[PDB]
């Protein structure tokens, strides 16, 4: 989280934490209670908004389920529907907590290391993302929208 | 800065700004209005402080201002306010910024060998720091004082 | 590196005076412009890849950088841009968040050309991908976040040309 | 290391659970206290000497342990300790913003106890001197704070001894 | 005396007419500054005593006013003319948290000319005193509500001289 | 208003506005919009309510429409609505103000003197205000009930 | 005169002590009814001269007190009469707000005794009307101010009886 | 107390207390939990800060305990202490109360002649209730420690 | 009479000053507004006698103002109304033309009131006459030219009632 | 001000603003910039244009600042010099109204009675105020240096 990121330098540079540190600390929790709100309705859409986003993903790409296709088979298709619904978790998580940290330590360092004996598309987690950031602002209003965009902007960032 | 402080951050990894960092650089130039409000309010009343503040320290440790004392004359009194009204800008300076980053490089760093090259007590330019900042958070609300009194905090902190 | 605010404070502190009219002038313009450069920030971002795509096909492809010859003929030599590029990208996108030329001068364009002389590298190709670049966000980004992100772009190809 | 957030953001991740009410409430409970941190934090960070000095005036020094014989004895042990002082005040201070003594766990307590057996230094001594720091630091911070600050110096003592 | 929105209350009354969209909109262009007015009037009522400290120092004192002949000269004298200062200091706050100089008008300036001129009061001198005044209330309260401030500054001594 | 109110008082005992007063005025100028709302909608509904307060009134004390009442006719009955309908302006001034200084000088004072020379009962013209505050709080969420009907309430003492 | 919160003070004041504990819960007990109080105030001043016509018509009309020979007979003394009631009736109020019958010891009922005497007042006959007040004001303010709006009620009756 | 400051006014008058007066004689009440909770803490550290008042007030005014003193002697400042005592039960006093009434009576009005006939020094006394308002500070919250230092200082104020 | 370039320069002549930054922008204020309010003049010339005439119908007419008794009963009462106004136009535009106060309170909101009530001529009446014009000029005159129209023709009715 | 000079010239006819009149006001209002500009750069310099035009009166006239002269002595000198700050003052304000209107009414009716009384050399002060039109249109462009001198032979006309 926040608190981490900044206590991490402190420690890294051997010092207490910063007088424009402080002010940002505090700054991330003040709108934490409009934010526990945010980050709870993508809970209670968990399941729906990833069954949905399958809906928009696997017909833009037709290959993913097609006989030369990574996803071929409902069980195939229960794993790709199943990494959808660990990155919601991941970015919900990263929502309620801050900084980078949650997705980034978690699922994002290694993506390419755990792909390169996978074999599954990267580009396609680049159009996944894409719509799941498109299906999940919906639910938001435009001034949660905008506490929700970067949030999601991140995965598409990164993978890049 | 505050703007500085993040963007840096950010080009140490090889990513873009962080959807964490497309945050408190908001608050902060939310708060830029008030921040050059109150250093605006800071720099109408720099003679009144520094005078008032000279005044306290004087009382408070009337032991530099005889003969055996470090600012002993009416010039080397002229020179502590002056070291004081440097102060005073350099508090300044870190409240418009929203970091102590420049106050830092400008009047911290290397303060302890000048002083004790000069022979000066360090103690008593600390004490007169946290007199001007009594005089200061005298003239502001509540609110403004506590953030301006939170650099001079800074200040007194980092003499010592 | 240094942006506005540590510009005027920098250039305040070196005479020694205390912020006057024109700094607070300066310092309000900046804070009044610090939403839209956050905004079409975050526009560069996510869409940078195909930020690139479109310029390299608008620019530097189709042309003499891909016949044998060139300085982009192979893969790797294809590879070194895309980077090269996301440079120029990134930064820039730094200089229109925290804007003042400052990073671009000391961090990217700061020996770049002696390195392309002793390394090959067509400088009039990579300052014209940086205009292409410029154009595709002057599109993406909107009507008058489109200017501020020209004159980082501006300043970039300038410099390195 | 983590604080309360991560806590509960691992402590999920773990069986894959999405945030719920509980861990909500645990995320409030944590977000409705911290200012107080922060403020605690700020106020020994402005006083981190003055503890120390106190701390060691009122639990280890005009004793045999700073005359010949003991383990402060000579300017060398005596800089030894009030850094291992300060280095606990610091670490103190960090476990109580974060809410949690993962960190000092993972970065003070792993080796101290059998280093400072190997060194000869007396954990009773340390012990003393941390209460010192956390009696001193209930002094100042205030009764917001106080049992925060306090908890996790009995965390640093408890661990030691 | 009358306010904002008692004057536009009793400007529809009197013509009988109800709360239309011209009056609701003045109503809240009052609204919308009802914070930086009570900011400013606790400023000032916090600093009242070194705002006429600092007014008479520049305008008043040190000069033919205090000494023998002077108007301000003798204790009492000196006593009446710092009371008269806080008097204009006073009714000038009042005026800005009530948005209007009706409280000025009916409370202030109505004989105060013939008063201080049956006195031999100097009403050239009053007049730079409040206008020192008002220079240092429009440096403690800054531009957020330093105009408000100055206009019924203005409005007494336009109306003393 | 609360800002006449408490200016007097402060005029009165010589001294600036205290922050308890400053607090008062900071609350009142935050319950503007509410206020403005509640007036907004009496104003739009005051035709009813002055109709069905009439009726309400003359049910209960028919004997005013009677040879011998005050009120016996139409012309003479259009005066009593025409009353009725003042006071509804003066509590909708009353509610946008925050205290009754407007009524207390528009509509209360010498109100006595006046309806003692015109003959007309001063307690059926207080049940005609009853039946005002009825109606209006049957057109109105509870707390916005309760701060009309205070000021009914204080009509209706001050009546009598 | 003293309310609820300076009678507490009044009694730990004349003993040296501070507020302890048992100060602490007396003082919540007072806090915890205070918006009952203020409605119940409201109410009764609402609805002042509607409480005394019933209990006049209750306790002292129609009967020899309005004929000749009695203390109510005359347009005078019935007057006088009804002031006392609303006198009564606006302390009652004042000390049900501030939560203590000091106000009532102090100002109502010193000498009122016998002034009473020395006038011929029927002093049954007035508690006979305090108490029909006390039955009418328990009836309008319902279960929750009835209570202790009887209670100063009963204090007076019992103070002039 | 507000309270009792609002019925007398209302008494002086002989009317009933005002809309606007019983709006304001509400917020004291709700402030009367944080008022307590602040007087019990101020009650607990009673001892602590008695004593560094007086180290505080000796340090500044070591002249008192000279020889040429009004508390020279152990028994003397024993009397110091315990005048200091009583002033910071007068201050929890008047917080628990919500305005400076009870204090007045009991603690300000003559206390001129109090020490000129005892032939003790104001400013030495105002020394050590400045410094037991430092004490008290440094024992609260910020906005507690605003509220105890209005007190504090109007304490200080009177005596002069 | 003033304008806003004469009471500026009035206001600063009383006290002394050369024109500073403050008054610079008021006159810089004015001069930008300098065109709209040229416009706006003749478009309330020409226009001006179906401005009255639709005024008139709007408030005037239809009422008790026509009937035998009113004030408007007969012809050359009639006369007297067009006439009576005609001024507040004429006036109120020589106001936004000059734009000031000053010349609606010399010439024709002085004594206005005296007059009236020496003649009959309901004040009620002439001030919803006033502000029926106020709506047609803001009808035909345009958006933003409708504000400070809608200034002065306030400005008359207030100070007319 | 033309202002006044053309509305008010179309208001002794009970005529509405001529057409003819819809024009000059029109060629003032758009080089009011240039004479706020002007006016501001004479401002700027008043100390110098003061100075400089004093200096070339006295060379010119020494009588004046001889034993027999009006102006002999410092304050006799420092009240010359205060006069022609004065005039300077009224050229700026004609020069902002764009009309001789203000500075005619402010200091040139009864000048011939104030300095005759005083017994001072008109021309001298004519001189003077030549001078001073020389020094500041020694600090003008062409354009400019008429505009303002035009004001400065309309002052040296009317004192005589
Ligand atoms: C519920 C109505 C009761 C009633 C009323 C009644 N009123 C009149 C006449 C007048 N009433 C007023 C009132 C006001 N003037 C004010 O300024 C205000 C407050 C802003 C008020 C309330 C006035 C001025 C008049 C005079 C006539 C007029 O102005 O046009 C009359 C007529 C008296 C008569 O007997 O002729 C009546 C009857 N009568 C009832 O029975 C009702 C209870
Ligand atoms: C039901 C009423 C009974 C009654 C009363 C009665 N009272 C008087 C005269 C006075 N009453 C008072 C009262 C007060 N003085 C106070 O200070 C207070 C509280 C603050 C009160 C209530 C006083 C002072 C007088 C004397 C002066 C005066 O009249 O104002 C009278 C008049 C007696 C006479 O005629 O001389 C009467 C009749 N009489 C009854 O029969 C009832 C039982
Ligand atoms: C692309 C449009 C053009 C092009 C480029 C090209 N570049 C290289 C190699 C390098 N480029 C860099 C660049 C940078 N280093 C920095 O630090 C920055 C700023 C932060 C920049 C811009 C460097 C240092 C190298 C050399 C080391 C490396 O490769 O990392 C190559 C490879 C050359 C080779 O084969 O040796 C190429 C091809 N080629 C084109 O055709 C365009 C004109
Ligand atoms: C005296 C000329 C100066 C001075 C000294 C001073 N010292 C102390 C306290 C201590 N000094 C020591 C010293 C040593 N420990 C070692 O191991 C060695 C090396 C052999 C030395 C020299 C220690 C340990 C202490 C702490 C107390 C203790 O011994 O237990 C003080 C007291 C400070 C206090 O705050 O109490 C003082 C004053 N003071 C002067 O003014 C001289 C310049
Ligand atoms: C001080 C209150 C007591 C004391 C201490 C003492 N410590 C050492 C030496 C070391 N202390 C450390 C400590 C740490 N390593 C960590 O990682 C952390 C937390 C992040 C701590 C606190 C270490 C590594 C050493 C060894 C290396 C070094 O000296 O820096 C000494 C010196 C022993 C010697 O002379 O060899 C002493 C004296 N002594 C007392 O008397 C107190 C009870
Ligand atoms: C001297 C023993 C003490 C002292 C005095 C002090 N006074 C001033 C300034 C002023 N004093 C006066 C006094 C009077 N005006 C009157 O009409 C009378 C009655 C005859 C008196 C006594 C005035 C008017 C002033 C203001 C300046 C002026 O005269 O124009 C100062 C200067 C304070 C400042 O801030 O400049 C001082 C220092 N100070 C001490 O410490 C002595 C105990
Ligand atoms: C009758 C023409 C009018 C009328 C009268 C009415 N009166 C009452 C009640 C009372 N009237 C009195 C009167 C007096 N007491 C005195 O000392 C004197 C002076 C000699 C007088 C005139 C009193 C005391 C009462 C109260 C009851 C009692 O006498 O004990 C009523 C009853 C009111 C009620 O609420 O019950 C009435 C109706 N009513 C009319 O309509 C006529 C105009
Ligand atoms: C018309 C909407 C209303 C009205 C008016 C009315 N007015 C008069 C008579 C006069 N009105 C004026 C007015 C002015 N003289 C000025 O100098 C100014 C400002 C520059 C004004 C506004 C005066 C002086 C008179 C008397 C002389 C004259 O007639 O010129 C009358 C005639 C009254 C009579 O018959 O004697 C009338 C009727 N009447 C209405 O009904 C409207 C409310
Ligand atoms: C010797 C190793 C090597 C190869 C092979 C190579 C290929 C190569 N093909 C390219 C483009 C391209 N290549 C193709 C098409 C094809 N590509 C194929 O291998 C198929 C035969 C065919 C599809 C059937 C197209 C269409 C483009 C243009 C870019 C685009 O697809 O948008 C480019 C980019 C530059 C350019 O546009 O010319 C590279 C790097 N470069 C190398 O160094
Ligand atoms: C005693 C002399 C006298 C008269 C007659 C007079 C008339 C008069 N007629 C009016 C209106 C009016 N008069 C009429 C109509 C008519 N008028 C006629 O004489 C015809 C019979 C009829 C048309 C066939 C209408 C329609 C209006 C309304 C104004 C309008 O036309 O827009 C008005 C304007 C006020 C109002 O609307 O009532 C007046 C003053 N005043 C006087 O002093």
């Known amino acids: 989280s926040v608190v981490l990121t900044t206590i991490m330098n402190a420690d890294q540079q051997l010092r207490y934490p910063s007088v424009g540190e402080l002010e940002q600390i505090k700054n991330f929790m003040e709108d934490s209670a409009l934010r526990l709100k945010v980050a709870k309705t993508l809970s209670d859409a968990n399941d729906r908004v990833v069954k949905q986003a399958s809906a928009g993903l696997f017909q833009r790409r037709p290959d993913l389920n097609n006989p030369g296709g990574n996803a071929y088979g409902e069980k195939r298709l229960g794993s790709c529907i199943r990494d959808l619904g660990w990155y919601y978790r991941l970015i919900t998580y990263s929502i309620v907590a801050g900084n980078n940290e949650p997705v980034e330590r978690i699922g994002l360092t290694g993506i390419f290391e755990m792909y390169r004996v996978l074999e599954v598309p990267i580009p396609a987690m680049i159009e996944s993302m894409r719509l799941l950031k498109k299906e999940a602002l919906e639910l938001l209003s435009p001034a949660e929208a905008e506490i929700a965009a970067p949030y999601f902007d991140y995965v598409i960032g990164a993978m890049q | 800065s505050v703007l500085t402080k993040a963007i840096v951050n950010a080009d140490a990894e090889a990513r873009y700004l962080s959807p964490g960092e497309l945050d408190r650089i908001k608050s902060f130039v939310a708060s830029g209005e008030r921040r050059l409000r109150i250093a605006q309010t800071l720099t109408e009343a720099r003679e009144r402080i520094v005078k008032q503040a000279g005044d306290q320290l004087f009382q408070i440790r009337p032991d530099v201002v005889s003969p055996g004392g470090n600012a002993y004359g009416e010039k080397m009194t002229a020179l502590c306010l002056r070291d004081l009204d440097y102060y005073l800008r350099l508090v300044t300076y870190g409240i418009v910024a929203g970091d102590v980053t420049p106050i830092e490089e400008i009047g911290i760093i290397g303060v302890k060998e000048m002083y004790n090259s000069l022979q000066t007590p360090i103690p008593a330019v600390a004490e007169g720091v946290r007199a001007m900042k009594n005089v200061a958070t005298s003239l502001l609300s509540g609110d403004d004082a506590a953030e301006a009194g939170f650099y001079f905090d800074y200040l007194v902190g980092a003499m010592q | ?161």
């Open chain 3, 1 to 161: 590196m240094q942006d506005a605010i540590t510009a005027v404070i920098n250039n305040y502190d070196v005479q020694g005076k205390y912020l006057d009219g024109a700094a607070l002038d300066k310092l309000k313009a900046y804070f009044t412009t610090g939403a839209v450069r956050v905004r079409a920030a975050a526009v560069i971002s996510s869409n940078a890849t195909t930020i690139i795509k479109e310029a390299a096909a608008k620019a530097l492809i189709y042309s003499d950088l891909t016949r044998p010859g060139g300085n982009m003929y192979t893969t790797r030599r294809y590879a070194a841009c895309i980077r090269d590029m996301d440079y120029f990208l990134r930064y820039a996108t730094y200089a229109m968040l925290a804007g003042d030329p400052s990073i671009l001068d000391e961090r990217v364009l700061n020996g770049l050309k002696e390195t392309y002389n002793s390394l090959g590298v067509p400088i009039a190709a990579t300052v014209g991908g940086i205009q292409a670049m410029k154009e595709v966000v002057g599109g993406l980004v909107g009507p008058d976040a489109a200017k501020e992100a020209s004159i980082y772009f501006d300043y970039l190809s300038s410099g390195l040309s």
